[PDB]
């Protein structure tokens, strides 16, 4: 159910952001907290909402797209554990909706409170910086600013011919049961001159038995895009496959990708001199083991045939609650 929108009966207050600056590339995030109050009375079905600007999201790197873009949210209660309201959040509209239950039918001057995780929006806010973060609760605007200090994905050896590669897991499907994940790898973020270049996507880090991840030809799809202008790349790891700045070249790799070795995939980039982006759609198992991963690149050559090198990179994500 869900009847009336009682925003006008509702007035939030005591709003604070746990903190106003963080690095979302090291599991940075914050929380919005607040008290609310119901001038008057209501009934099962009424509801109020909260809405988030472009800058933040309410699900961060947990994907819900395979769940009708709907994020369950732990119930709102009284002290006897009585479920006062049921809550959820729409990934698309960035709308929290709290819908009362069989509890409100006999009370007035109602008071509750929430605390809700807030994460960056990697598409909306793709470059380190300060953004307007005006949050709406029950038609009242609460204004803030968020600074994102992304750990530059431009990372690798300090050598002119040094292997350099980074990557992030930017969406994980915990809810649907499909157990999918989305990961952006950047190969040659430094856009150096690189010889016989090799890449590896692992479903684990040092220990297989320590990660749920699974990387096989059957569990894993890969799309590769030559970048036009590296500077135009996101600090956030988001990559829009439809950016003109990216040219999908997945068709140049039919015979350069191997799922031979366990929980790994290898691409043969060859002789390259600019950045490439790899979209990973993969899956992890029901082991409950955390999803940990690592990508590595090595290059030989270039114009010497010696001074070979290698650089690696690790991912895992963290879960918060509201």
């Amino acid at each position: 159910a869900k009847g009336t929108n009682v925003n006008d009966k509702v007035t939030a207050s005591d709003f604070k952001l746990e903190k106003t600056a963080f690095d979302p590339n090291q599991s940075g995030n914050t929380f919005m907290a607040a008290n609310f109050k119901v001038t008057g009375q209501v009934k099962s079905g009424d509801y109020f909402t909260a809405k988030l600007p472009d800058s933040v999201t309410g699900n961060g790197d947990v994907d819900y797209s395979n769940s009708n873009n709907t994020m369950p949210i732990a119930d709102i209660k009284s002290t006897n554990g009585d479920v006062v309201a049921k809550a959820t959040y729409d990934i698309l509209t960035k709308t929290y909706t709290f819908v009362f239950t069989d509890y409100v039918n006999d009370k007035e001057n109602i008071n509750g409170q929430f605390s809700l995780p807030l994460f960056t929006d990697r598409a909306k806010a793709p470059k380190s910086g300060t953004y307007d973060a005006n949050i709406n609760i029950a038609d009242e605007m609460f204004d803030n600013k968020i600074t994102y200090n992304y750990s530059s994905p431009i990372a690798g050896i300090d050598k002119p011919n040094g292997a350099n590669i980074s990557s992030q897991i930017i969406g994980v499907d915990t809810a649907s049961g499909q157990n999918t994940y989305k990961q952006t790898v950047f190969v040659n973020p430094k856009q150096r001159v690189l010889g016989n270049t090799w890449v590896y996507i692992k479903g684990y880090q040092d220990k297989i038995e320590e990660s749920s991840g699974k990387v096989s030809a059957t569990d894993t799809k890969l799309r590769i895009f030559e970048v036009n202008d590296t500077s135009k790349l996101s600090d956030s790891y988001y990559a829009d496959p439809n950016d003109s700045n990216l040219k999908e070249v997945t068709g140049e790799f039919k015979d350069k990708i191997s799922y031979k070795y366990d929980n790994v995939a290898s691409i043969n980039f060859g002789d390259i001199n600019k950045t490439y982006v790899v979209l990973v759609e993969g899956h992890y198992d029901n082991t409950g083991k955390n999803l940990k991963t690592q990508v590595i690149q090595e290059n030989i050559d270039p114009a010497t045939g010696k001074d070979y090198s290698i650089f690696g990179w690790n991912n895992e994500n963290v879960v918060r609650y509201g």
Binding site: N59, M71, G312
Partner: peptide, 14 residues
């Protein structure tokens, strides 16, 4: 040789 990054998100209480 290597580095790293980690991410974060909400399970939705579940």
């Amino acid at each position: 040789y290597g580095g790293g990054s980690s991410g974060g998100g909400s399970s939705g209480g579940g």
